[PDB]
């Protein structure tokens, strides 16, 4: 019938900076001689490469870049044993996002960056620009923004909870008409949780 689905991974990661490149690797155990990468979004496209075979694994590295807005969107990979093409089942989708296209937001901690254990921490991501939503990442949550606030800011609050254990957080802003196009990253925020004396 139809061959199994390949695996689709992005190196170094899912979020790509503007004018940089990302390697979307597509690999499978089936001896696929051809790999096809398809993007759904503003500018749909299908790229073809031939697959190398090493240690019983067929694979092909797709080089997406230098990153533009037209290259952002949902990607799926297909494998094929024959040409002139019997495509396999599509891979799991990957949402490739371009970042750094708008002013960076501000990321703050309430009540503070360092709290005692059990005390609550809420990360507020704000900006004078009318971003429609904000994305919080700890080294991925999306929350819609609220209307004009203090200083005309658009803002979103991410409650971390009682037992967050902290970490380093970054925030991105985005508009709802272009889901895969994000702003410059906010400055990193170290959230530390020390024990109660």
């Amino acid at each position: 019938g139809v061959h199994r689905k390949p695996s689709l991974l992005a190196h170094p990661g899912r979020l790509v900076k503007s004018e940089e490149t990302v390697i979307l690797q597509c690999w499978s155990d089936v001896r696929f001689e051809h790999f096809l990468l398809h993007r759904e979004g503003k500018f749909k496209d299908t790229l073809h490469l031939i697959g190398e075979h090493h240690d019983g694994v067929s694979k092909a590295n797709f080089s997406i870049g230098p990153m533009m807005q037209d290259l952002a969107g949902t990607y799926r990979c297909y494998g094929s044993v024959t040409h002139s093409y019997q495509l396999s089942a599509p891979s799991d989708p990957l949402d490739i996002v371009i970042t750094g296209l708008y002013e960076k937001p501000s990321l703050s901690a309430q009540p503070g960056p360092t709290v005692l254990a059990g005390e609550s921490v809420t990360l507020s991501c704000s900006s004078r620009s009318s971003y429609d939503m904000y994305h919080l990442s700890r080294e991925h949550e999306c929350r819609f923004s609220a209307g004009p606030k203090v200083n005309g800011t658009f803002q979103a609050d991410f409650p971390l909870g009682p037992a967050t254990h902290g970490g380093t957080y970054r925030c991105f802003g985005s508009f709802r008409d272009s889901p895969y196009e994000w702003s410059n990253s906010s400055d990193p925020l170290l959230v530390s949780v020390i024990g109660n004396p």
Partner: antibody, heavy 121, light 109 residues
């Protein structure tokens, strides 16, 4: 209340450049986005791009990526659009518009009167 | 690249007639971000219907809007002489925002 005054009719030669203005009054110029549309005679409207005057951040239609340049001057509450490498196909009436809310996707509520540019030798 | 096709491109109605016009999108459009504009020759387009159904300020109740997914419509219950104009639909569901080819409404005699 809210009014958008665009620059007057302009004649430009092929291969040159033209710059048109869109002056805002009746609202905080910095709090809202500004859109620019192209309408050739007897056709629908094309979206060129958008600019947020507070940041001067931009987002262009891929079709007009190299054609148009969007700038803004906050001291004068004025947006500008500069068209380069002019063709006869660039002859049209160009509009500026402000959406209902600060969200750049909300309905284009307020509209400037449009600038007619004629490109001919 | 959400293409909006308006049908019919041109139509004519008598005074007091019921008018209807359609806007078809190549992809699904969220109903909150489909808008209708009315334009008369020489003047700028005017917001007529926002978010599929809601009438803008200063738009008579004889106008109405409806639709979802890929098909949307604008309807006039009884035609008036002032209604004769070109109507455009516009999606801002996905950038680039796109406008339809327009439907020209004229007075039949």
């Amino acid at each position: 209340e809210v009014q958008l005054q665009q620059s007057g009719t302009v004649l430009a030669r092929p291969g040159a450049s033209v710059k048109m203005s869109c002056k805002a009054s009746g609202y905080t110029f910095t709090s809202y986005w500004m859109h620019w549309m192209k309408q050739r005679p007897g056709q629908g409207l094309e979206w060129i791009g958008t600019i947020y005057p507070g940041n001067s951040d931009t987002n262009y239609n891929q079709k007009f990526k190299g054609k148009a340049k969007l700038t803004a001057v906050t001291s004068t509450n004025t947006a500008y659009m500069e068209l380069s490498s002019l063709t006869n196909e660039d002859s049209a009436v160009y509009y500026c518009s402000r959406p209902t809310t600060a969200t750049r996707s909300s309905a284009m509520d307020y509209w400037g009167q449009g600038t007619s540019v004629t490109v001919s030798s | 690249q959400i293409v909006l096709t308006q049908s019919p491109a041109s139509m004519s109605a008598s005074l007091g007639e019921r008018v209807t016009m359609t806007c078809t999108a190549s992809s699904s459009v969220s109903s909150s971000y489909l808008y209708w504009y009315q334009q008369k020759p020489g003047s700028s387009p005017k917001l007529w219907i926002y978010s599929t159904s809601n009438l803008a300020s200063g738009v008579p109740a004889r106008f109405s809007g409806s639709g979802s997914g890929t098909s949307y419509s604008l309807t006039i219950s009884s035609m008036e002489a002032e209604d004769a104009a070109t109507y455009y639909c516009h999606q801002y569901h996905r950038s680039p925002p796109t406008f339809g080819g327009g439907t020209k409404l004229e007075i039949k005699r």
